Write a protein that binds this ligand. Structure first.
Ligand SMILES: *SC1=NC(C)(C)N(O)C1(C)C
Ligand SMILES: [Cl-]
Ligand SMILES: [Cl-]
Ligand SMILES: [Cl-]
Ligand SMILES: [K+]
Length: 164
């Protein structure tokens, strides 16, 4: 297991434009295209991202290319953020993947707002952090995914992704 395999489980793989859990147009392995309700806007974002006129459908190689860029962007967002970077630096590699997962799903600004959870993670108070992380819109709206990510923070193991 690694961050790529973890996010591939959590986001799935779909080669045609679809709507994500929040109703937003998305493609590939959780590549958000736009928050606009306009399918035409989503299609224009897709063509710009891929560099060709798509019919709303991409190949698996194209999906994996966007995915690599998106994982990279999540890491860069963590490293450039004054609240996320010290927490990331304090974590082991498994828990770092858990943080990248959150940033991939919610963005740098959203995760940086989890001030109390981030403090508990920096303190390595894993059970307390797990309780605090669940008191969130994130957990209530995507509880099975959030439970997997939280278990990863709680244990520092890949147990929540093993039989998946
Ligand atoms: S991509 C795309 N743009 C329009 C609105 C024409 N679509 O119906 C697609 C094929 C999803
Ligand atoms: Cl892009
Ligand atoms: Cl330490
Ligand atoms: Cl709490
Ligand atoms: K998804």
């Amino acid at each position: 297991m690694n961050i790529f395999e973890m996010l591939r489980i959590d986001e799935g793989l779909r080669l045609k434009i679809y709507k994500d859990t929040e109703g937003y147009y998305t493609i590939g392995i959780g590549h958000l295209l736009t928050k606009s309700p306009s399918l035409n806007a989503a299609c224009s974002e897709l063509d710009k991202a891929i560099g060709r006129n798509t019919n709303g459908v991409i190949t698996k190689d194209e999906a994996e290319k966007l995915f690599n860029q998106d994982v990279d962007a999540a890491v860069r967002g963590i490293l450039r953020n004054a609240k996320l970077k010290p927490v990331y630096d304090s974590l082991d590699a498994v828990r770092r993947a858990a943080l990248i997962n959150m940033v991939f799903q919610m963005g740098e600004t959203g995760v940086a707002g989890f001030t109390n959870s981030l403090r508990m993670l920096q303190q390595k108070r894993w059970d307390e952090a797990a309780v605090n992380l669940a008191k969130s819109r994130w957990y209530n709206q995507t509880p099975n995914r959030a439970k997997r990510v939280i278990t990863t923070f709680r244990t520092g193991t890949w147990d929540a992704y093993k039989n998946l």
